[PDB]
Symmetry: D2
Subunit: 155 residues, 4 copies
């Protein structure tokens, strides 16, 4: 049953401590969702852009449909990921932002902070993000297309 919707996951070093939580939260959104962990495999020092880039590139080719990125605050992951054309990476810190990133911006990557946001709210963020459809409205689609034109104008 289902079309498999793969979700690539990456972290930095402080968020490596919650990488198994992120895997689990992705599966809790629904049985169609399959996590693909791309993050650091150990507690060694890492630079978040390297994992943002790995995830974001998978998202942009649609090797996976969605990404989940975690760092200290989420901010660094959101800046790095959005540098990949085709990506719409949303820094989410609550239910509202998780849902609205989907509804308005059809976001494809959710970025969270391990040092900022407690794990039960991260859970709620991921699940909300992965359960929430895009609105379908003309103005939202138009705005998203405008982002694509910004990318095209710098390519």
């Amino acid at each position: 049953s289902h079309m498999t919707r793969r979700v690539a996951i990456g972290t930095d070093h402080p968020a490596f401590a919650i990488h198994e939580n992120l895997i689990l939260y992705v599966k809790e959104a629904g049985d169609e969702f399959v996590p693909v962990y791309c993050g650091p495999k150990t507690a060694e020092s890492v630079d978040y852009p390297d994992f943002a880039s790995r995830v974001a590139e998978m998202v942009a080719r649609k090797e996976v449909e969605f990404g989940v990125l975690a760092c200290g605050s989420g901010i660094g992951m959101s800046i790095a990921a959005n540098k990949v054309p085709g990506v719409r990476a949303a820094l989410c810190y609550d239910h509202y932002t998780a849902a609205i990133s989907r509804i308005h911006n059809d976001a494809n990557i959710v970025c969270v902070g391990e040092r900022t946001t407690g794990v039960e709210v991260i859970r709620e963020i991921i699940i909300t993000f992965l359960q929430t459809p895009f609105s379908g409205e003309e103005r939202h689609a138009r705005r998203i297309e405008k982002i694509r034109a910004i990318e095209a104008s710098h390519a």
Copy 2:
């Protein structure tokens, strides 16, 4: 005395209601800061990416040193602004994010949500963003340079 530091400001339609607040909060960060309002001039309908692009291009050229973007949640502005090379636009919702986006990521645009974040916290965000210096640390600079290598790899 001082070097003048210009700060470009842009909004969408819901955040046009607070554009005078944004101008004020930028001046309160210190008398070297000079706001340059680039956002909508009336309550007319707008698409946030048009103003994200305007502010982000100004920052990327260094017509201004910093930008402030406001929309519903902040998220659209961050996604759009980050599509301009040279921009590092941070979605901030509290003091900690405002500070850390400077300390770790040397962020040059601060993005806030008028529907999500009350004005006294938007104030605190802007002021904190504009008074907080970049850490200087080797690992933070190295990561920021990896962000630029992401942009160059798609140029």
Copy 3:
């Protein structure tokens, strides 16, 4: 199948959103009726006078729930919880709104107008009113402990 009354009060900064708070109660469903008790005007007011008015309504059961707003929400939650029978929850997001119900059977939601934007206030109100109490024994036990603290100072 009575409707469910929801008393509402504010301080002066949150008077600017008193119409939004009435609206969001109604948006939680036709079974919820707002009862506005807050300042009628933009005059100076002290939050505890409105916290007390709402909280007394909840504690006597003239309403089922309360909504309080001030600058940050915190003032209201401190004041309202000084009335016995009140469990007033400062909420700032969906999770807090929901969990205050689930775990604490909270009867008053407090929000900040200076801190929290109106669409998240909306979500908080709607979630608070729609979410049921867990019914679980450990939560009921903890809530009974809170009542034992009030009774030890009555």
Copy 4:
């Protein structure tokens, strides 16, 4: 003068009790934490720890409290049932500061499931370091809270 800070948790927040002790000390050498929370990972009911800390504050045995549970809210409802206590649910710097500035809050309540530890640190430091405004309208409101408590005693 030593400013003492009593600390309590529930079971989920027991996981960060060492953090809480640390962040209090990080607010200045004069702040001393007094850990009153559960000593192990056993089951507990937050109102029992809220009551412990809140009575210490209300009877002037310590100047401040810090209470942590899942969300912070249980602690803040429980603690505020003790007369003399002004317990503030804080989730960021602004709330931590303003609770002091406006309400001279004496207990800070935080959520371990909701707020990451580096923000909890900021909250604790800011709460302990920020002074009460002293302004007449704040003092009047705080005395109104005491009158609510006195009207139900």
